[PDB]
Design a protein around this ligand. Structure first.
Ligand SMILES: Nc1ncnc2c1ncn2[C@@H]1O[C@H](CSCC[C@H](N)C(=O)O)[C@@H](O)[C@H]1O
Ligand SMILES: Nc1ncnc2c1ncn2[C@@H]1O[C@H](CSCC[C@H](N)C(=O)O)[C@@H](O)[C@H]1O
Ligand SMILES: [Cl-]
Ligand SMILES: [Cl-]
Ligand SMILES: [Cl-]
Lengths: 9, 220, 220, 6
């Protein structure tokens, strides 16, 4: 299902 | 781009993950139960644009891929099609589907317990093939091949509805649930290589900024 | 760029893989035992170009990262350096190293049992840090961090030697052994972000064309 | 160690 967005560093 | 070797490990881990997912709407939504209603409303509206009338997909038969317990079948497909077939690799979810799809279960033709990468849809049988939140569980090679087999499963004027998370940049391989979140370029590349073309596509509205964007595709 | 989520499962599968890998040269080479001898020959030459001389890397201390049983230490490092330290996550390999290294084992200062993504090379201690066929077992995020800590472990004029498989185009994620085969561009990007500069660069010759190319990098 | 190509 839906997933939390990941961050890019 | 990325190539996945060791596909056996990939699919085995996914079965271990879903063995602990509860056979409920909340389990199907990965605990994002508050997003089920806006998901369903957008899917209903999107389906209406491509079904019914001359030259458009018929309303006789639909296939629900990675159905889980049948959330999409209950709220999107069964109100529209005369018969619906569910396919999912989890026997527990399909057992629960029979109870979950109570009011309209008489129109459910079959519950197919198979993994999509091992599943051959019958030739020219379906007006609509619905693939929601499961394409990320197939490798690129297996998804490409599965989409080609789905094309062969469509009746004339039939369409594939693909709905999934689409990463904003680059792909994400998540080893906890054995999923790959693809970006738009990779996804469109696999659709093209499979012999399909995008009849239409729409971004899911009403979803939170904290979640990966969700997109719907009508393919034929 | 591609990203890996759920590292816990990534590193865990790697330990399960190496628990079944024999503590032999054939185990280290992944049943490419015939390639060990040309590997040694190319590494000895490459090392001679950056070690011993004015402004060149000293010959006092070396670190063998992902040493396994010490194949590289035995044939490349211990002949050149006064003391060599091995670091590997499998204590079974470090234990066998004491046999396999034979007389050269007398110049081993310590056998460190650590995962590289948890290891911090002692500050300003090594003239050469050798990282061979293990960088693929670290995620891009963990490899960047580890290279930065290696740079801090270097003495004056010290260098890092990195030797690994490098894809000609497109990365490969092997879930059977939990390794990423990076390609040239993404690997150079990770080296750059870590604050390291490429001194030398050579492709391994004499390897079968059916193998992924192998490259050596001198970095500081 | 060394790995096969695709
Ligand atoms: N390889 C595979 N073959 C068949 N089903 C799979 C699969 N990998 C994951 N699944 C199924 O895909 C479902 C994802 S949860 C999504 C459920 C449903 N599409 C909905 O939107 O409500 C789970 O039921 C899981 O059992
Ligand atoms: N995350 C990690 N941290 C430390 N060592 C690791 C590691 N992942 C794999 N390794 C080690 O890396 C080695 C890869 S086999 C390579 C051995 C040696 N470098 C040679 O060239 O002969 C194995 O010994 C394995 O135990
Ligand atoms: Cl970000
Ligand atoms: Cl995103
Ligand atoms: Cl550089």
């Amino acid at each position: 299902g839906p997933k939390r967005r990941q961050l890019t560093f | 781009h990325m190539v996945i070797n060791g596909e056996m490990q990939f699919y085995a881990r996914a079965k271990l993950f879903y063995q602990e997912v509860p056979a409920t709407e909340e389990g199907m939504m990965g605990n994002f139960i508050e997003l089920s209603s806006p998901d369903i409303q957008a899917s209903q509206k999107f389906l209406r644009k491509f079904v019914g009338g001359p030259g458009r997909a018929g309303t006789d038969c639909a296939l629900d891929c990675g159905s889980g317990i049948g959330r999409v079948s209950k709220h999107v497909l069964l109100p529209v099609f005369n018969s619906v077939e569910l396919v999912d690799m989890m026997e527990s979810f399909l057992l629960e589907a029979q109870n979950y799809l109570q009011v309209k279960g008489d129109k459910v033709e079959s519950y197919h317990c198979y993994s999509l990468q091992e599943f051959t849809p019958p030739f020219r049988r379906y007006d609509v093939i619905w693939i929601q939140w499961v394409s990320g569980h197939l490798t690129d090679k297996d998804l490409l091949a599965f989409l080609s087999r789905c094309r062969d499963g469509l009746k004339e004027n039939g369409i594939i509805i693909l709905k999934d998370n689409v990463a904003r940049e680059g792909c994400i391989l998540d080893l906890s649930d054995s999923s790959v979140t693809r970006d738009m370029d990779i996804l469109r590349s696999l659709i093209r290589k499979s012999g399909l073309v995008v009849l239409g596509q729409e971004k899911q509205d009403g979803f939170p900024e904290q979640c990966i964007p969700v997109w719907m595709f009508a393919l034929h």
